[PDB]
């Protein structure tokens, strides 16, 4: 046979043979995932399987999505797919999909929480702008970067690891509120990551969205008219009834004492670091600083590299199916 089974991380692994010695590195609710060495490569892998792809439509939706996206996709700051197979040997037996990927060394969540170090900050905001960039061009707008879904090398490269469309901390008030949204809903999220690396804090977080439209009036201030006008009446209704905030101003909101100290590069960098945060974060997304734009700020422009940034688009979601049909549409995809 060409494959073997093991037991990993308390979830059975069928792989092809040139997958070995599969350790846990975590898992998500998309699926559990391996390291693994991969003998034909002679490199060590990534392997995904996907946890209940059937279950439902929604699963079914994102797994295939997932698949032909990671496929298409050729960019150096989003996941690669490596290879996909199924143990199962036919539609009918058809049962579960691996994904092998690039192993990374870690994911944002445990980068945020080491000492800021400008050089770090700055090159691993321009990696996710890129990354955006890429993605918003093709027409995806994520609406759910967050730390745990993005990864990194011990080289601090960076790659973004899923499409988008649970921690809720990280979303754009005009999602929170639900007014629609453009490309620059993804800025606001950067924003929230960002101000996490200087803070070492989540920075508005809430048992739920009531709370954490809490935290952004108080830090950031209660909206303009300008906004409020843009609201459902009704939702409208419930902002405007909440106490009126000043906001905290991003000086004292993101302090000196947050940010290396006692050099003039050191103070240059504070202050640069800080302008950034007071254009990313900015409730209304009509006022907030674009992805092109935050890339020619001088934060992240010492960074800049046309090859990397403007890269060609890839040419390729409303569409529903029976959770038969999905299966069958994913199984292809799989058998390529
Ligand atoms: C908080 C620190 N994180 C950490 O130490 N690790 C996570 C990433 C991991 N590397 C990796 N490399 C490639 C992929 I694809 C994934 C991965 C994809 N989806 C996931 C979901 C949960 C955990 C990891 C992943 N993860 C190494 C271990
Ligand atoms: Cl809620």
Redesign the pocket.
């Known amino acids: 046979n060409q494959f073997y089974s093991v037991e990993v991380g308390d979830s059975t692994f069928t792989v092809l043979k040139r997958y070995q010695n599969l350790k846990p ?4 609710a ?4 391996c ?1 693994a060495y991969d003998a034909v490569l002679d490199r060590n ?4 399987k996907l946890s209940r792809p059937f279950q439902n439509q929604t699963h079914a939706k994102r797994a295939y999505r997932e698949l032909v996206l990671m496929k298409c996709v050729n960019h150096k700051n989003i ?1 690669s797919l490596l290879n996909v197979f199924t143990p199962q040997k036919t539609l009918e037996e058809f049962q579960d999909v691996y ?1 092998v ?11 945020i929480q080491m000492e800021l170090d400008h050089e770090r900050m700055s090159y691993l905001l321009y990696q996710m702008l890129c990354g955006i960039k890429h993605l918003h061009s093709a027409g995806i707008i994520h609406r759910d970067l967050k ?3 993005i ?1 990194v090398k011990s080289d601090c490269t960076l ?1 973004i ?2 499409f988008g469309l649970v921690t809720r901390y990280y979303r754009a008030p005009e999602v929170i509120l639900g007014m629609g949204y453009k490309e620059n809903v993804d800025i606001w999220s950067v924003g929230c990551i960002m101000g996490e690396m200087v803070r070492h804090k989540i920075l508005f977080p809430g048992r739920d969205y009531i709370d954490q439209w809490n935290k952004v009036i108080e830090q950031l201030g209660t909206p303009c008219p300008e906004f409020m006008k843009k609201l459902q009446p009704t939702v409208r209704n419930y902002v405007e009834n909440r106490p009126k905030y000043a906001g905290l101003t991003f000086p004292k909101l993101f302090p000196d004492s947050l940010f290396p100290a006692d050099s003039e590069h050191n103070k240059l960098k504070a202050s640069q670091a800080r302008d950034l945060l007071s254009k990313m974060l900015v409730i209304d997304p009509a006022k907030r600083i674009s992805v092109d734009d935050a890339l020619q700020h001088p934060y992240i422009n010492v960074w800049y590299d046309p090859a990397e940034v403007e890269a060609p688009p890839p040419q390729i979601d409303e569409r529903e199916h029976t959770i038969e049909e999905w299966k069958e549409l994913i199984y292809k995809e799989v058998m390529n």
Do not use: F, R, Y
């Not at 590195?25 to 998500?28: E, L, M």
């Not at 990927?101 to 980068?111: F, H, I, T």
């Open positions: 590195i975590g898992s998500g998309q699926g559990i995932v390291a892998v990534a392997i995904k996941i994904l990927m690039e192993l990374m060394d870690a994911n944002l969540c445990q980068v730390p745990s879904n990864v790659k690891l899923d």
